[PDB]
């Protein structure tokens, strides 16, 4: 199949405004949220129907208990960081863990943390070590690496457990995750630029580009973002500016899910 990824996020806020949760945890398969938990509901809930239909209530009961424990642990870790940064006010602590099963069968795994939305600690499961960005992170790094068993544990989880969960979730939601809706592609003009617009496609992974007389023009092209249309499909665009003094053969190229497409502007 195509490349797929599973990743879990945590967010902790030290002094949140009234109502806003102190802790939020969301999991994703590719772009799809699958799980959610926060300090307000204190329940772990599915965020995809195919997760709700395939995981029995004892699963959500168990992970509700785990997330309540991890919520308290995250609060303690954020308290430690902010005191050691000597920081006042509200600050954020984030975590991301997960893995990719690539098309060719190889795998990747990652685990990292952020403070105030910037890299803080990054795990290297091949050297079994943490990369620290400053001296507050360095202190944490020393503590986490003194426990060699915890490093081995995370390496095993990234390389074995994460990949096995992902394969399981891929089967559950295969009607969603493994489908293909090809893009509808058009070109129009909007001093003057050609816009190549695609929409109605899934998966969101798409490559659009312009070529001039057969050569690519990377430095001259404006790339739009891949945006959700709201119905489970996506849209994207790419524009290029027209030479008013000399004609050229411009063509839009779109690659999506193994099919290549060319729109030559006449």
């Amino acid at each position, epitope marked *: 199949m195509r490349t797929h990824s599973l990743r879990y996020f945590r967010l902790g806020v030290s002094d949140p405004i009234h109502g806003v949760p102190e802790f939020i945890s969301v999991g994703y398969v590719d772009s799809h949220p699958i799980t959610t938990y926060d300090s307000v509901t204190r329940q772990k809930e599915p965020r995809a129907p195919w997760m709700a239909e395939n995981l029995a209530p004892d699963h959500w009961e168990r992970y509700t*208990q785990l997330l309540r*424990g991890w919520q308290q642990m995250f609060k303690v870790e954020l308290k430690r960081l902010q005191r050691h940064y000597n920081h006042s006010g509200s600050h954020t602590y984030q975590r991301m863990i997960g893995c990719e099963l690539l098309e060719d069968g190889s795998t990747t795994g990652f685990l990292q943390y952020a403070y105030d939305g910037q890299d803080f600690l990054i795990f290297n499961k091949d050297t079994l070590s943490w990369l620290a960005v400053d001296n507050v992170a360095h202190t944490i790094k020393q503590a986490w690496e003194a426990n060699q068993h*915890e490093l081995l544990y995370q390496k095993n*989880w990234l390389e*074995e*457990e994460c990949i096995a969960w992902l394969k399981r979730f891929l089967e559950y939601g295969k009607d969603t995750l493994q489908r293909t809706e090809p893009p509808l592609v058009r070109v129009n003009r909007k001093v003057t630029a050609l816009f190549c617009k695609a929409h109605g496609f899934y998966p969101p992974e798409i490559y659009m580009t312009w070529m001039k007389n057969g050569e690519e023009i990377v430095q001259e092209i404006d790339y739009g973002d891949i945006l959700p249309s709201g119905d489970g499909t996506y849209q994207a665009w790419a524009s290029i500016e027209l030479d008013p003094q000399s004609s050229n053969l411009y063509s839009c190229h779109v690659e999506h899910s193994g099919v290549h497409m060319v729109l030559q502007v006449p």
Partner: antibody
Amino acid sequence: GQNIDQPTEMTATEGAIVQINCTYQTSGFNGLFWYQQHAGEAPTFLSYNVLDGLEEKGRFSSFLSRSKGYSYLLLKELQMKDSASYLCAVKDSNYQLIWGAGTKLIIKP
Amino acid sequence: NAGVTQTPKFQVLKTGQSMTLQCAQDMNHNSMYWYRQDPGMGLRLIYYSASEGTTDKGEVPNGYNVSRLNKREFSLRLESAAPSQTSVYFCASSVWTGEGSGELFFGEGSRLTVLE
């Protein structure tokens, strides 16, 4: 469904070597623990393995093969004080411990 | 300090009688567990407490209830003792739960005999 097996009882001679086996069939794997429990007392932690290979720790070494679903606790130069039950426990995919029934190690002086 | 302290060490019970087993830990742990140990089988979890302020059932919760009074204490309640609850009960704690390689620290154990 989820299953761990170890021998009920083993008998070896003082000063010899004994290898206590633990096989497990589980949904997922997050580590294998060995605990020592003297008769009438509490279990105490001995070792942890989560990757393949052999870890040493004094007279005790613990081995793990994840593909075979197999571990052993190796006790060298047996002494009378090694007479105890040895419990193997595996953490499954939801981080829940599945416990073996334990192996009673009898040492002949 | 003391580690895990559970009481009583021994108890005889008549069928239908109530009983509370106490357990405290002074290691600043967050997760606490109640196990029963019976001949010929592995430890079975009765109830557990992943952190202060939350508890949930284990493998064999029927006939028991628990209370995570605070961060230190986790009591086990037998409301109506049954002969099948004759067993050795162990309370344990760990720093966290789901933090991968953390081990359990056990109390001394409580031996219960329920008689008709």
